[PDB]
Design a protein around this ligand. Structure first.
Ligand SMILES: OC[C@@]1(O)OC[C@@H](O)[C@@H](O)[C@@H]1O
Ligand SMILES: OC[C@@]1(O)OC[C@@H](O)[C@@H](O)[C@@H]1O
Ligand SMILES: OC[C@@]1(O)OC[C@@H](O)[C@@H](O)[C@@H]1O
Ligand SMILES: OC[C@@]1(O)OC[C@@H](O)[C@@H](O)[C@@H]1O
Ligand SMILES: OC[C@@]1(O)OC[C@@H](O)[C@@H](O)[C@@H]1O
Ligand SMILES: OC[C@@]1(O)OC[C@@H](O)[C@@H](O)[C@@H]1O
Lengths: 90, 90, 90
């Protein structure tokens, strides 16, 4: 019923991404230094966590979206979100 | 009823901050290398996430506190907690 | 009933650790660049958060596991998980 969030950031400006799980849907809000805006991430789930890392200037983000006991990893590597190889046996 | 936590850290010592949402209140415990102590952060919410980054030696922390479907961003930039510009339309 | 996750990463490969709280047990899945595998972390709790930092090449991880209103810190410093000094008065 109530929302759950996860957050990551990179750089010095910085860039910030905030993921919100709300009523079974996870969405993304973005800051790149001047105004919040809506990101491309849209995936189902009731729970979210996130981590990210830089390779030089290139950001890589991994979002772990869970529904029930099933966790799906979503990957940003500069050119769209794709499903990752993560599995777990919950 | 049960608590929910979020954590961030910076440096090599390191500094650690742990935020706990408990019965609608979010509080902060701190480690700077020698003993845990209570931090200045006190804001309402049932859910918390956090991210942080360094600009040189200066730490910046962003805490995302949610109550119901409403998320408020709180900002530490070295001189007190202030409300951030984050909005979302949950 | 539904799982809750936390995630951290380090380096450029990168290394990723995903912690899952499920039915009162927290477990760990690991990525070091080529295949997911099960980590050594096994501790009780209904809620998990995590942070990590590098000292040179040496990773240090702190997992905050909560049951009810009681939070226990677990420490990885390269040679096994040990209970940390964290306390809180929830
Ligand atoms: O600039 C916004 C954006 O491209 O940033 C990287 C990822 O967070 C994307 O989902 C997002 O749309
Ligand atoms: O390039 C995608 C990928 O290999 O990135 C590292 C890990 O997140 C993997 O699960 C994932 O499939
Ligand atoms: O040294 C403790 C402290 O000043 O560290 C920075 C922020 O975490 C503050 O809320 C906190 O009181
Ligand atoms: O200086 C505060 C601020 O600009 O920092 C970056 C973002 O966290 C913004 O939402 C926030 O208002
Ligand atoms: O390579 C896996 C491993 O050793 O990595 C460091 C920690 O995450 C441990 O719990 C884990 O078993
Ligand atoms: O070496 C372990 C330890 O000192 O590391 C820093 C903090 O996580 C402390 O709570 C913890 O006991």
């Amino acid at each position: 019923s109530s929302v759950q969030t996860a957050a990551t950031s990179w750089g010095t400006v910085p860039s910030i991404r905030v993921y919100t799980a709300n009523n079974g849907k996870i969405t993304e809000r973005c800051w790149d230094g001047k105004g919040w805006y809506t990101g491309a991430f849209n995936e189902p789930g009731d729970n979210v966590s996130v981590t990210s890392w830089l390779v030089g200037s290139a950001i890589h983000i991994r979002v772990y979206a869970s529904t029930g006991t099933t966790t799906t990893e979503w990957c940003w590597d500069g050119n769209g979100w794709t499903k990752g190889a993560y599995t777990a046996t919950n």
